Design a protein around this ligand. Sequence first.
Ligand SMILES: [Cl-]
Ligand SMILES: [Cl-]
Ligand SMILES: [Cl-]
Length: 124
Amino acid sequence: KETAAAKFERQHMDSSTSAASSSNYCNQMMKSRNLTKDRCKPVNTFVHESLADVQAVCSQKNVACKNGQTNCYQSYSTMSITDCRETGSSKYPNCAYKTTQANKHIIVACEGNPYVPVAFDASV
Ligand SMILES: [Cl-]
Ligand SMILES: [Cl-]
Ligand SMILES: [Cl-]
Protein backbone atom coordinates (compact mmCIF):
# COMPACT_ATOMS: atom_id res chain seq x y z
CA LYS A 1 0.00 0.00 0.00
CA GLU A 2 1.09 3.61 -0.65
CA THR A 3 2.16 5.44 2.50
CA ALA A 4 -0.03 8.37 3.59
CA ALA A 5 2.79 10.86 2.86
CA ALA A 6 3.30 9.48 -0.61
CA LYS A 7 -0.43 9.54 -1.38
CA PHE A 8 -0.57 13.22 -0.42
CA GLU A 9 2.25 13.97 -2.85
CA ARG A 10 0.67 12.08 -5.61
CA GLN A 11 -2.77 13.63 -5.13
CA HIS A 12 -1.78 17.15 -4.28
CA MET A 13 1.60 18.25 -5.50
CA ASP A 14 2.22 19.88 -8.85
CA SER A 15 5.50 21.76 -8.57
CA SER A 16 6.19 21.56 -12.30
CA THR A 17 3.86 24.49 -13.06
CA SER A 18 3.33 27.88 -11.45
CA ALA A 19 -0.40 27.67 -12.01
CA ALA A 20 -3.12 26.13 -14.24
CA SER A 21 -2.95 27.88 -17.61
CA SER A 22 -5.74 25.87 -19.34
CA SER A 23 -9.32 24.88 -18.65
CA ASN A 24 -8.21 21.40 -19.39
CA TYR A 25 -5.57 21.19 -16.68
CA CYS A 26 -7.78 19.26 -14.28
CA ASN A 27 -8.91 16.69 -16.81
CA GLN A 28 -5.31 15.98 -17.64
CA MET A 29 -3.88 15.94 -14.15
CA MET A 30 -6.68 13.95 -12.60
CA LYS A 31 -5.98 11.27 -15.12
CA SER A 32 -2.17 11.47 -15.00
CA ARG A 33 -2.16 11.09 -11.20
CA ASN A 34 -4.49 8.13 -11.51
CA LEU A 35 -7.29 9.78 -9.73
CA THR A 36 -9.85 8.62 -12.24
CA LYS A 37 -8.79 4.98 -12.24
CA ASP A 38 -11.62 3.25 -10.52
CA ARG A 39 -13.90 6.19 -10.31
CA CYS A 40 -13.96 9.93 -10.73
CA LYS A 41 -12.55 11.45 -7.56
CA PRO A 42 -15.11 14.26 -6.98
CA VAL A 43 -12.88 17.04 -5.70
CA ASN A 44 -9.13 17.48 -5.56
CA THR A 45 -6.73 20.32 -5.10
CA PHE A 46 -3.25 20.64 -6.59
CA VAL A 47 -0.62 22.95 -5.00
CA HIS A 48 1.91 24.67 -7.28
CA GLU A 49 4.72 25.25 -4.78
CA SER A 50 7.82 23.29 -3.99
CA LEU A 51 7.44 20.22 -1.88
CA ALA A 52 9.71 21.75 0.75
CA ASP A 53 7.46 24.79 1.04
CA VAL A 54 4.41 22.65 1.47
CA GLN A 55 6.09 20.39 4.03
CA ALA A 56 7.13 23.49 5.97
CA VAL A 57 3.42 24.24 6.56
CA CYS A 58 3.52 21.55 9.22
CA SER A 59 5.54 24.02 11.40
CA GLN A 60 3.19 26.92 10.75
CA LYS A 61 -0.13 27.95 12.32
CA ASN A 62 -1.79 25.09 14.17
CA VAL A 63 -5.54 25.03 13.60
CA ALA A 64 -8.39 22.60 13.95
CA CYS A 65 -9.22 20.32 11.06
CA LYS A 66 -12.82 20.34 9.77
CA ASN A 67 -13.20 16.96 11.45
CA GLY A 68 -12.32 18.33 14.84
CA GLN A 69 -8.83 16.88 14.80
CA THR A 70 -6.09 19.22 15.97
CA ASN A 71 -3.15 18.25 13.70
CA CYS A 72 -4.00 20.77 10.97
CA TYR A 73 -1.79 23.65 9.97
CA GLN A 74 -2.58 26.72 7.97
CA SER A 75 0.11 28.26 5.76
CA TYR A 76 1.26 31.76 6.81
CA SER A 77 1.28 32.91 3.21
CA THR A 78 -0.97 32.22 0.27
CA MET A 79 0.05 29.59 -2.29
CA SER A 80 -0.81 28.98 -5.93
CA ILE A 81 -3.44 26.26 -6.10
CA THR A 82 -5.85 24.66 -8.53
CA ASP A 83 -9.15 23.27 -7.41
CA CYS A 84 -10.45 20.38 -9.56
CA ARG A 85 -14.16 19.42 -9.28
CA GLU A 86 -16.39 17.20 -11.35
CA THR A 87 -18.98 19.03 -13.38
CA GLY A 88 -22.64 18.10 -13.43
CA SER A 89 -22.05 16.24 -16.75
CA SER A 90 -19.27 13.91 -15.45
CA LYS A 91 -19.72 10.12 -15.58
CA TYR A 92 -17.12 7.51 -15.08
CA PRO A 93 -15.30 6.61 -16.92
CA ASN A 94 -15.83 9.85 -18.70
CA CYS A 95 -14.68 12.06 -15.93
CA ALA A 96 -14.89 15.84 -16.61
CA TYR A 97 -13.59 18.50 -14.30
CA LYS A 98 -13.87 22.26 -13.90
CA THR A 99 -10.50 23.93 -13.30
CA THR A 100 -10.29 26.86 -10.89
CA GLN A 101 -6.94 28.55 -10.27
CA ALA A 102 -6.45 30.70 -7.15
CA ASN A 103 -3.95 32.00 -4.59
CA LYS A 104 -4.98 31.02 -1.07
CA HIS A 105 -3.71 29.78 2.24
CA ILE A 106 -3.72 26.01 2.47
CA ILE A 107 -4.68 23.94 5.51
CA VAL A 108 -3.14 20.47 5.80
CA ALA A 109 -3.14 17.66 8.38
CA CYS A 110 0.31 16.53 9.43
CA GLU A 111 1.59 13.37 10.94
CA GLY A 112 4.58 11.14 11.49
CA ASN A 113 8.22 11.29 11.72
CA PRO A 114 9.18 13.18 9.82
CA TYR A 115 6.03 15.18 10.38
CA VAL A 116 4.66 15.77 6.94
CA PRO A 117 1.42 16.48 5.23
CA VAL A 118 -0.98 13.56 5.05
CA ALA A 119 -4.16 15.26 4.02
CA PHE A 120 -5.41 18.38 2.39
CA ASP A 121 -8.15 19.93 4.59
CA ALA A 122 -9.10 23.13 2.84
CA SER A 123 -7.87 26.41 1.44
CA VAL A 124 -8.73 29.93 2.58
CL1 LIG B 1 6.81 8.10 2.24
CL1 LIG C 1 -0.41 5.69 -8.90
CL1 LIG D 1 -8.60 18.12 -2.04
